[PDB]
Design a protein around this ligand. Sequence first.
Ligand SMILES: O=C(O)Cc1ccc(O)c(O)c1
Ligand SMILES: [Ca+2]
Ligand SMILES: [Cl-]
Ligand SMILES: [Cl-]
Ligand SMILES: [Cl-]
Ligand SMILES: [Fe+2]
Ligand SMILES: [Fe+2]
Ligand SMILES: [Fe+2]
Ligand SMILES: [Fe+2]
Lengths: 356, 360, 356, 360
Amino acid sequence: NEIPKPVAPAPDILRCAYAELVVTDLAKSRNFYVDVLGLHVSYEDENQIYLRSFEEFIHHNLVLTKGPVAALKAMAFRVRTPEDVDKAEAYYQELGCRTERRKDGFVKGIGDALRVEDPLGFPYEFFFETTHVERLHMRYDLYSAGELVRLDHFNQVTPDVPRGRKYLEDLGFRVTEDIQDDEGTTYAAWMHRKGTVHDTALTGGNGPRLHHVAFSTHEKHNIIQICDKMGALRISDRIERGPGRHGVSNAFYLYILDPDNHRIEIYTQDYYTGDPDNPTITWNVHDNQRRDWWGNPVVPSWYTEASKVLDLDGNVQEIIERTDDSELEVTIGADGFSFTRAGDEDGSYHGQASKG
Amino acid sequence: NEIPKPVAPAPDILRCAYAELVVTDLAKSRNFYVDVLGLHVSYEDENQIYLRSFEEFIHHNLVLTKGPVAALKAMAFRVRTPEDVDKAEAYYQELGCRTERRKDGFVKGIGDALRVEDPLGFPYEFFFETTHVERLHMRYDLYSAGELVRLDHFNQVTPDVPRGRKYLEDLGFRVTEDIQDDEGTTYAAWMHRKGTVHDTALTGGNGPRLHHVAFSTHEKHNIIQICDKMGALRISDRIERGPGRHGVSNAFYLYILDPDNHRIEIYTQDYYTGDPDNPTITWNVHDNQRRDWWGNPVVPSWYTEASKVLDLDGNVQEIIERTDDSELEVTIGADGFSFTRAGDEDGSYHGQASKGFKLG
Amino acid sequence: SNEIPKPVAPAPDILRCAYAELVVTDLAKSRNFYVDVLGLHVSYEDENQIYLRSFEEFIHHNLVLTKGPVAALKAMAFRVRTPEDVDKAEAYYQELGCRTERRKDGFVKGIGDALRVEDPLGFPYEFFFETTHVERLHMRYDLYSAGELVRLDHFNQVTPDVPRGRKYLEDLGFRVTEDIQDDEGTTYAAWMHRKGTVHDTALTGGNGPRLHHVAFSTHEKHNIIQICDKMGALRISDRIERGPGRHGVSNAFYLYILDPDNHRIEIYTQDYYTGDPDNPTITWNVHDNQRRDWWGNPVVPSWYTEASKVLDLDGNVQEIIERTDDSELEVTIGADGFSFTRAGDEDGSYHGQASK
Amino acid sequence: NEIPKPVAPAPDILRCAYAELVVTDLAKSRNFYVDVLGLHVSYEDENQIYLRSFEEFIHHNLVLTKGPVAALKAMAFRVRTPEDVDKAEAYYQELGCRTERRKDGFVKGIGDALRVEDPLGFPYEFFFETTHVERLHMRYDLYSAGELVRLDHFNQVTPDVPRGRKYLEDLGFRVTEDIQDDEGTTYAAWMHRKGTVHDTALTGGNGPRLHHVAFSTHEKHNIIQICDKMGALRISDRIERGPGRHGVSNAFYLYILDPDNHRIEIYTQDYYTGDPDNPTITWNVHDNQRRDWWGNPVVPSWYTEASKVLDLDGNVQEIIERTDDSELEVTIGADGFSFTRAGDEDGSYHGQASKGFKLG
Ligand SMILES: O=C(O)Cc1ccc(O)c(O)c1
Ligand SMILES: [Ca+2]
Ligand SMILES: [Cl-]
Ligand SMILES: [Cl-]
Ligand SMILES: [Cl-]
Ligand SMILES: [Fe+2]
Ligand SMILES: [Fe+2]
Ligand SMILES: [Fe+2]
Ligand SMILES: [Fe+2]
């Protein structure tokens, strides 16, 4: 049922800022994120690793926290002013959501912060205050052939996309692209605060689950190098999907799996969305160029697998089942369909994925 | 001489949107911007060419207007709402500036628009309404090896950088980087509204003049290809400076000259500046990696040459001489100095440019 | 045995692969693919043929498209070092008992004295020295496409008995650089060279003679990406067969696409130097899931089963001989096949299924 | 003083294979070649460092030998068979050159080898036997953003280019490109054995001196990264020239200087030359696109500075002065000139370099 628009003003959200991920083996996770992927350590101890991308000046973009059950603990957005943390708290209380505020932060390098169990069951954090660190954007002495340069977005699995979309729109996120069919079903939506295609996105599925966290590279060859490195390390089985060109977003991309199966996307070269009348793009779910522009098939695991999320007590959120049609089933399942050219039988696929 | 902060609220500016350049030979200019550089035509007739970048959805990023004297006619910024055009009007009127309002626009594909003679003598346009066109961002069947994908920024030559900087800060532009010395002189500042290093910038010098308009590419090889193509067309004399890596902005770059000597920068891969406490970077004017990170010398024309700007009547604005120290003189001139490593004489340059060159 | 005995006559000194003549059924449709989509440069054309070359070529052409009733390879041509090498080629193939045809004025425009042969594997080979030089476009950056094809790199031939063909090609002066074998002693594929790259031709085990593909190179990996992107924009992504990827064998970045008659074209870049005579030969195990695609992406079955007909010297289709040796498709992705990411490790292995 | 063609057959040369450079401080040289540039160690001790590129399978491409005077000690070419070492010995003996044969090599990982003081005063080595090592071409776990993938070529400074060219042609090198003027002077020539633009090249100047050793990258961005890294390390003063696109060779390039001022070129994407009638390309010396296609000026040090070379006793070879015209002088000197378009004054430079600089 619809989530009401509060009377209270929404906080001014700048961008996605960091994710806190619970991991089971801190050493194995460090090897993946630091040794394989080259993220930069801002702080570490025996319980947590704080990591940042090459161009970041805030304390971190990723916190790995040792715990018993691998899951998303918080997806954090930075707000414009300290007063926006107050606005966030008032807004979510009006929404009837559980909130927790700590003046000294939940993780190192973040000050006054509000965590909330949002209407879709996700742990959101809003903060302004953060400890500045050395911005490594010109440290070409450190630069990796696969260098991850920015945190770009999150992607959330939720059972009712329109319900979630309206809520995020009220919160100030503008939809840039979406996937629908001719029967009124929405399968996915992308929405932004900062001037890129998205800061978060909704993928229709059983939820709440975290689909992925995405980092940017400068160039397409940097993504290719990550694949090449993973072949050399003989861990190509942890490449899930890609590399490719997205239809939706137009970005070059790759999806890989961390030691706890948390999915990480590598992403580059989407477009500017900062104008308020930025044209919304709607794709048909049966268009075989919507996810991979080259028509490469989307592996079923990409649709079915995603990370658990925690509530404010650190317990796993119960999963609610999607009743709307499944993107997997309608495109690549036994009764699925996709096309290369709308209305052309040639280059269409019935009851199977593209390319054989 | 300080420009006061108006009581009237500043318009909410989104980004640089387009420039209108007066050109003397429309066909020669079209050859440069369309045939050489690959910009996309939104409209053209005997008097004007309207051009846009690969990823743009507003009507245009560049208007070429035939006229007797080559000059910048307007640098245009898009504002967030129609109401912001009224705000801009009230703001500049409070500053004591001349303003002109046209409900149906000054150029095709722009609606209600305000043009102003700003306090630094520059013709700024503010608008919201614009005719949307086909966004070509996935038209890879059109994509050039040198494709210009966005309009990124303007750069303005002005004699008193602190005076201009304060005015633009009150307008909502935050300074991301600057160049100063230890004697209190500011030589240049970069300032933004959209989340990149800048939408405009001030370069110290006699002004008002337009230093350049900058377009972005996706990747560094795209900029390399523009150079390569200019060599194949045997117009390498129109490559002024570059390609290089900037210190300030960290962008890969190239400067080229159009048929009327309007300078165009091609630019890629600067960083995100959208957070309100984005760290402001100050480089010393004597640091030889500040403009070109690799230490390549900055050709003197880059410091001395820039385009005329017009007032609202279309007449050239009179030039006011800079009295602050000259970046050229203090770095590559007779009594100039630059260093590679602060405090190291090794890799320093005295009275000449880096890499074995002197001023011609 | 059915070995191809080494002639006493000296082998012609072969420089490199030089051009292919492909018979096509609709010349205008083929022109649109090779010129408009792929950007090859016209060296001559009329109502029956189109002659095309790559960006860095100075000989007359790398590809001749000839209108005919049945799409097929008509000749795969190698340039020899001197005019006398055409004589050597004729004596060599005559000793092998092969049908030969010598045209002192060439078979196609821009080639002079030329010998065509029905080789012992049933392939139409041409050997020539004389060719009309044309403008080398290597610095014509005013013409350069975002997907520019810069050189002709190699051919790949489907033949039933790889060792038989390999020894024949070795006698002809081709050195094997890489191959794929199993522990039981079966050879599935071999790559072999004259010029200093991984190959000028290659043998893929299968029913033959059939032409598997013709390969062109690009300068950089982004040029191959652009070809894919362009094909998506033209809504012909169904003509992208496999890739883009990193090869295991050759280490080259690659893509396979299909022309209007289903002739397969590979785009290829950045293999390694093989010109030293003791260049180390690399043998991969057939069950290694990084041998073909280094990133472990699956090889679609059509890549193993589909290939172009070849013609005899009368222009008739050559009869096909079925492979009796084990099938690479069957032993890797068929019902009883398997592959591994790490030898000996069931984690990352695939059984009776392809990867991913 | 022409060098006659021997009756004895030339050795069959495959390619350039390695250079032995004498360096004065082994640790500082190691920092440059291993830490800055990322070359791979095949062997090292207190006296020498043996280095190879990413795709090499022979033992090394570069030997750094500690010694009192920095210099080229040997430029080594691999020959096709063991018997070609005997052919090289007979060939150079017929030429009247000093030869030294060591059945177990001069440096580690090379077997039977011949070193000669060649007719141009250069120390050449010919060998077949070399210890194979792990070919790192797919070791993407090691791959750096600036990875050097192959040894491509040498470049030699010699006073009489036609005299040297003839000698190298008799040895089997074929000329691919050269630079001449209308009055019949030759300034430079490029020549090959393997199917690239060159394995060695001759630059007119006082000699024998070693101009540079060149390594390849996969892509242009790899060269850009080397520049970026040198800026981050605050050693941009060791970037001599570039990055650029060459006219001659069409390769993307960069020139940097090691701790002893030995010049290293980074290079990529030249073209195939393996056909025996490969078209030769001759450029006019006044063509400002011949060296840098984009017309960027050639720094005077590029023309004047080069490394000493040693004789077989390890003593520095005496230098012979060039008497033919100087490329520096005829192009960028006070009486030089260059053009963008032949015959066009627009885009031409007289008495100075392109882009607005004169000689420092
Ligand atoms: O199938 C693969 O991926 C192996 C491979 C390597 C080199 C090639 O040129 C080719 O066509 C196939
Ligand atoms: Ca001072
Ligand atoms: Cl997707
Ligand atoms: Cl600059
Ligand atoms: Cl040069
Ligand atoms: Fe994503
Ligand atoms: Fe700029
Ligand atoms: Fe191939
Ligand atoms: Fe060189």
